[PDB]
Design a protein around this ligand. Sequence first.
Ligand SMILES: [Mg+2]
Ligand SMILES: [Mg+2]
Ligand SMILES: [Mg+2]
Ligand SMILES: [Mg+2]
Ligand SMILES: [Mg+2]
Ligand SMILES: [Mg+2]
Ligand SMILES: [Mg+2]
Ligand SMILES: [Mg+2]
Ligand SMILES: [Mg+2]
Ligand SMILES: [Mg+2]
Ligand SMILES: [Mg+2]
Ligand SMILES: [Mg+2]
Ligand SMILES: [Mg+2]
Ligand SMILES: [Mg+2]
Ligand SMILES: [Mg+2]
Ligand SMILES: [Mg+2]
Ligand SMILES: [Mg+2]
Ligand SMILES: [Mg+2]
Ligand SMILES: [Mg+2]
Ligand SMILES: [Mg+2]
Ligand SMILES: [Mg+2]
Ligand SMILES: [Mg+2]
Ligand SMILES: [Mg+2]
Ligand SMILES: [Mg+2]
Ligand SMILES: [Mg+2]
Ligand SMILES: [Mg+2]
Ligand SMILES: [Mg+2]
Ligand SMILES: [Mg+2]
Ligand SMILES: [Mg+2]
Lengths: 244, 23, 65, 181, 170
Amino acid sequence: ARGPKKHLKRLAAPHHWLLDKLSGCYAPRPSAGPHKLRESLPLIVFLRNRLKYALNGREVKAILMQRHVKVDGKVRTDTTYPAGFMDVITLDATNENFRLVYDVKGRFAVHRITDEEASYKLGKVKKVQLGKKGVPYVVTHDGRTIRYPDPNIKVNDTVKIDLASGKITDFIKFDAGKLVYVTGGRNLGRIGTIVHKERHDGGFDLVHIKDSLDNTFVTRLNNVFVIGEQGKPYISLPKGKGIK
Amino acid sequence: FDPSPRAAKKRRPAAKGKNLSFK
Amino acid sequence: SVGFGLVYNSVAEAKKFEPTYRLVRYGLAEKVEKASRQQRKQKKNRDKKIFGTGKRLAKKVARRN
Amino acid sequence: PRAPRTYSKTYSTPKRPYESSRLDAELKLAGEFGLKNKKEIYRISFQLSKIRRAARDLLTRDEKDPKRLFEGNALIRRLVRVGVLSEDKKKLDYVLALKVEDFLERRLQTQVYKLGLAKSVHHARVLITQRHIAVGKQIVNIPSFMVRLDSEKHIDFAPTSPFGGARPGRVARRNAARKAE
Amino acid sequence: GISRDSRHKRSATGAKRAQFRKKRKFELGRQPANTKIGAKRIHSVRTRGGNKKYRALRIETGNFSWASEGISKKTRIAGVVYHPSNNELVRTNTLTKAAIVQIDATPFRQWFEAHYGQTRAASAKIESSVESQFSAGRLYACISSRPGQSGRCDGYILEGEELAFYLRRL
RNA sequence: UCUGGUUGAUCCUGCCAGUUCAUAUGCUUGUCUCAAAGAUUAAGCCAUGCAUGUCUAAGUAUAAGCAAUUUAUACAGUGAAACUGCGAAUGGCUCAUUAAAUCAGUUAUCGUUUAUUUGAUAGUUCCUUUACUACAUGGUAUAACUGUGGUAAUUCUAGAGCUAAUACAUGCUAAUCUCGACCCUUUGGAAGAGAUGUAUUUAUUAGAAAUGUCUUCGGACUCUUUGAUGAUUCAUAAUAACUUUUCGAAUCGCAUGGCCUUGUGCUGGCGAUGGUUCAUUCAAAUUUCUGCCCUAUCAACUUUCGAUGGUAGGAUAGUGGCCUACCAUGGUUUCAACGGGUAACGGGGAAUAAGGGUUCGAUUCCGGAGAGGGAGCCUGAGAAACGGCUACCACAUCCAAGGAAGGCAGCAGGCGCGCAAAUUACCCAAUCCUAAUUCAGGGAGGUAGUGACAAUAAAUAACGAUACAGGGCCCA
Ligand SMILES: [Mg+2]
Ligand SMILES: [Mg+2]
Ligand SMILES: [Mg+2]
Ligand SMILES: [Mg+2]
Ligand SMILES: [Mg+2]
Ligand SMILES: [Mg+2]
Ligand SMILES: [Mg+2]
Ligand SMILES: [Mg+2]
Ligand SMILES: [Mg+2]
Ligand SMILES: [Mg+2]
Ligand SMILES: [Mg+2]
Ligand SMILES: [Mg+2]
Ligand SMILES: [Mg+2]
Ligand SMILES: [Mg+2]
Ligand SMILES: [Mg+2]
Ligand SMILES: [Mg+2]
Ligand SMILES: [Mg+2]
Ligand SMILES: [Mg+2]
Ligand SMILES: [Mg+2]
Ligand SMILES: [Mg+2]
Ligand SMILES: [Mg+2]
Ligand SMILES: [Mg+2]
Ligand SMILES: [Mg+2]
Ligand SMILES: [Mg+2]
Ligand SMILES: [Mg+2]
Ligand SMILES: [Mg+2]
Ligand SMILES: [Mg+2]
Ligand SMILES: [Mg+2]
Ligand SMILES: [Mg+2]
């Protein structure tokens, strides 16, 4: 091609959306945004295929142009806006707060949360660096830049972000015995505790995770998301608790 | 010694089916 | 028989959110009369061959002939 | 373009169609069960061949093997539900003993004949294709419809049928009108 | 006309490769900028993205640094005395990176006199060769900028082993 | 692969005879669901039509437009045209070229560019002509429009007159922070000593026994002072200059709140569009390792005109013989280099088979490449674009002969024979994409039509009564 693509065939769409192969020839191509194309759920899919509030794309546009949908507390009017893991979707008219978390199947679940839990989200620290004028900042998995972080925050840690202010309330270090959620691979959606982090310099780190049933599995460090201490997650978990 | 927030309560649906007969 | 049904909270909301063709079925809207796609596209191309309002072209051809 | 829609063939021509024993067997089957042509027998043979090949492959595997347990249990459940396999013969060894007559036994045509709604298999076929037979609340016009154990007791004449309580067909009321005239 | 693609070359084994495709815009080159001493003539180039490059077609001044003293002064360029890549560039007085040039000594001499009050003594002591050049009136400098890329002809005054090496080469 | 013969009767070796897929074609063709449409190695040539445009309250209307009005006093509703912005680099089609190339899996960018999206991010007080626009600068300016015209002819346009901007080009408006004597002992006051953006280019620099005393029993007394990576000349900061040198809001909608010393005073809400840098996302470009069919009656090849490497420069978004100058003489090869053939786009896949294997894969998804054949470019974040431009070759249309206009391997539909095969149909309602934008557009796509492509189910009859006759069938 001579430039960026703008279409997406249904057979080429992410499998976890569960799109009918004979419904049409194209799928909603997610727009650029906080989350990657293959790891995002566009708002059209969520509103039409999952919640069934809209019967087609036109009704989704009608809902969005009324400013009824908020994503992490901000009104979004783009049908293909890439909502992703740990995003909070608010529908005030229906009194609904949802958090996007994969289930054991590996698909984003329709998980309803309370307003108090909807007031915050979790972000995996992807980067920590000094910006201009020597101001430290952290970049999270959703692309948020947060300035003046706690000096203890390091990469692979999890920061609790208050959506109203976009500031760090608390954080969890990446360490053995911490509760982790799998966000990639065939173990996508499972929850467990870290047992060991195998280090290979110049290569990909491996993490061993043990679930409550004592089953152990190995995963790349990129696919691991610390969500709390064992027995004390910082977010409500979907049905199944990431077992199997 | 073993080292080991609540989800929103589900709601009964607001609306139910309605039946009518005529003729 | 099995089908789908919608009951809006107001007639104004129904007019606001319903598709135009369903409103036309129910008589809530009048069918807009338009030329066929081929006629509209040919007219668009003919207009595309003209720059500006085109009245000066008309007066020029009138003077020429 | 749109994604492809899958399809498959439901039958296969036999290895040597011209064996005299095979022709006589097909004659007997078609006559007994009122089948239209050899393609129906080939279809049932193809299905039974798939089933028995699967059962043989599972029997090859060790007992308590997860694949054997899972797939064999599913196969036995399906065969028992359709009525081909008896409840007391819930083993793959008896799955290997199945025959085409067992599957032809469950066709709606044979059931309609046997329940007494029809005096012949061909009368049963004519009744089914003419929309006189209902399995439960549903009118079924397919003779090859495979009847389940639960459905077996619900075969009757359709409410719309002249034989099921509706008004007489066109021939009857036409003759009545002529006679009255 | 200029392309930087590696497909037109022979393979490491020596095979002659066939044309895979037509030339692409993202592997182009442009004409060289043979910068020369004279009144400043610079023209902009629109490069990949909205970015711009500056082509120094002509330039006669530049910002040269005395690194021992830690200063920089803007000075006129007299001419190109030595170039390691090609002597034709010296012959034609073409300004490029690494070209050894002669610059006016006046601003550096004036700064030295003002700062040290001499034409304290220990700090005012400098290399004998540099002082000889100051007496001559011109200083040998090495151009550290790329005139055809940034439009600047900056550099630094040669000192120490580099100065001795280039004096030998001259 | 099996079957039967060749003997008086067997075994072995021979002979004889019978034993899906692809192409082309013949006949028949009622019902339901569903679905496809290549082929002269001719990537041969195409009449005609269409396939890419786009406007919100929110960039620019004195249309000599329409309609309104408390009948208008800068404008204000709606709005052709035109400027401005964005898109047109996506999609669709075809398989010509291409044999470590593409492609598949697997890597790197500590080797680079990236419109858009998402998140952050910019008080520089002062600094002589203050002889001062910021209660807001210019034409260094034009379109549409008015009017005068040329040509046979085209989405050809000339001369003259006007007028706008988020176009173009200029240009401004008593701050904050360190210490803090002295009072006062806190909710402290502050005489005074000091400090002050970005962007570009270069050079330099940084980035590594207080175990005590007192105290109110708390606390205070001296000291610390960058981060990351496996790894950096990294992030970042500092100094001195440099620059045809940037940026640091002269923009727009809706609404009219709060203070008063009552002034058209001061202040002030919710949005739109922009703007510097960094991060993110959508991408792009290169890139590590292993893997391709036939050919040895192709054994040496590359290196003169870059082949392998070194130094420097140029060019690039950037690495790099990518190119240049000077140097060496290297690099590949019987473990098949190089050359040749390919009815060679690669893969996921399809068929067959008991297994090993063999064949097919233009063809619904991914990647590559092309737009009659070579070559070069403008614009743009992104193209070596072809429903953009310029030349050459081959074809080819109009002409008043002076010129002017071309690219169906996009959707329909034609020629290529004198022998043949889907509709020049309807629509943006679904899928999604584009725009300034819910609305406009979309031969992308969908709907229907049309040779039994490949598949699914399945009618053309079912049940009776009576009469007559004695033969009917099977083996051999
Ligand atoms: Mg394309
Ligand atoms: Mg994994
Ligand atoms: Mg790494
Ligand atoms: Mg127009
Ligand atoms: Mg009926
Ligand atoms: Mg019918
Ligand atoms: Mg008006
Ligand atoms: Mg308006
Ligand atoms: Mg070859
Ligand atoms: Mg390779
Ligand atoms: Mg855009
Ligand atoms: Mg932004
Ligand atoms: Mg004029
Ligand atoms: Mg170099
Ligand atoms: Mg050379
Ligand atoms: Mg092939
Ligand atoms: Mg080929
Ligand atoms: Mg292929
Ligand atoms: Mg191309
Ligand atoms: Mg052609
Ligand atoms: Mg553009
Ligand atoms: Mg081209
Ligand atoms: Mg075309
Ligand atoms: Mg195109
Ligand atoms: Mg065509
Ligand atoms: Mg023909
Ligand atoms: Mg706007
Ligand atoms: Mg089409
Ligand atoms: Mg008939």
